[PDB]
């Protein structure tokens, strides 16, 4: 998940990131980062519960 | 900074902030600025050396005190505004060279990170293992405890 966030950051830093409809670019970057980290939290939680 | 670290003309209490992006240097001698001491890092090394620890171990006899650390320019007081311009290492392990250096331009190091806590929160054991509202609750209850 950390490496994925790094990839998203590196993409935004090269202007290769395009906003989703109804969102500025920064909101799009924050959405993607929060999605990655939420998925990581859910996956680790499931592993612990198992 | 050299003068302040020598304690020549600028007392330790004085804050000097350079805003590089702006072109302002701000110097404050007011009363009421909250500050904290930090270890000075030059290049990538603590200015605090083994000899300072040796001299402090014998502070009972030789009288070498905290004030001598400040006088020898090994520790500094940093207020919040100056902290805005500091590059701070959490521990000296951050100054060790690494495959991909994060910073490599540290100016200061923490003495010990547990110093972020006040008097009541300092009696909690393993506070870094509790949910934070629980540390807050102990911080009050400890003032209600009989001794």
């Amino acid at each position: 998940a950390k490496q994925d966030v790094i990839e998203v950051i590196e993409k935004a830093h090269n202007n290769e990131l395009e906003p989703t409809p109804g969102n500025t670019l920064r909101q799009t970057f924050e959405n993607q980062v929060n999605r990655i980290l939420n998925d990581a939290r859910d996956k680790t939680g499931s592993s612990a519960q198992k | 900074r050299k003068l302040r670290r020598q304690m020549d003309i600028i007392v330790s209490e004085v804050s000097m902030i350079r805003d590089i992006r702006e072109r302002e240097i701000r110097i404050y001698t007011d009363a009421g600025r909250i500050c904290r001491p930090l270890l000075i890092v030059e290049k990538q090394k603590l200015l605090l050396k083994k000899r300072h620890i040796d001299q402090l171990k014998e502070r009972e006899y030789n009288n070498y005190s905290w004030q001598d650390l400040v006088a020898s320019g090994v520790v500094e007081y940093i207020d919040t505004l100056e902290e805005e311009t500091v590059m701070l290492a959490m521990t000296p392990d951050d100054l060790q060279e690494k495959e991909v250096a994060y910073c490599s331009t540290y100016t200061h190091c923490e003495i010990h990170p547990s110093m972020i806590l006040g008097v009541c929160a300092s009696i909690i054991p393993f506070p870094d293992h509790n949910q934070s509202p629980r540390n807050t609750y102990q911080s009050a209850m400890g003032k209600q405890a009989m001794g």
């Binding site: - | 007011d30 009421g32 909250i34 207020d79 919040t80 505004l81 902290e83």
Partner: protein, 142 residues
Amino acid sequence: AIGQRIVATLPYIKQEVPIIIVFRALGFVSDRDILEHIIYDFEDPEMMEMVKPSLDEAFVIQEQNVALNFIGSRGAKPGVTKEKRIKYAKEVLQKEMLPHVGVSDFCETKKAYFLGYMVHRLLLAALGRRELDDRDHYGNKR
């Protein structure tokens, strides 16, 4: 109206004063001098455009005594005499405005420079070249 005017609210003056009027009351009449105190790089047209409404708002008042009378009239209890109004306005500008810059006579240049710096900071905020200040930042507290 068309643009954005800059107005200073002085202590003991119950109405806002156009900023250029304050600068003139300090003894700077030429627009060039006032802008030299406010804008440090004349190669910055954007800042120049941002100050014109303030120059226009105070265009009739072109003399120090006229501006001083303006401020004194704006005072809390204006004196019918114009001489006493000017005296009161001068006392305010010398003693109640920016005391930390100086409260003695022959301090109009320092006061003008600090007021120009304040206007410059406001312009930088309005142009989005400098972030607004955080009231809860503990460096801004004592």
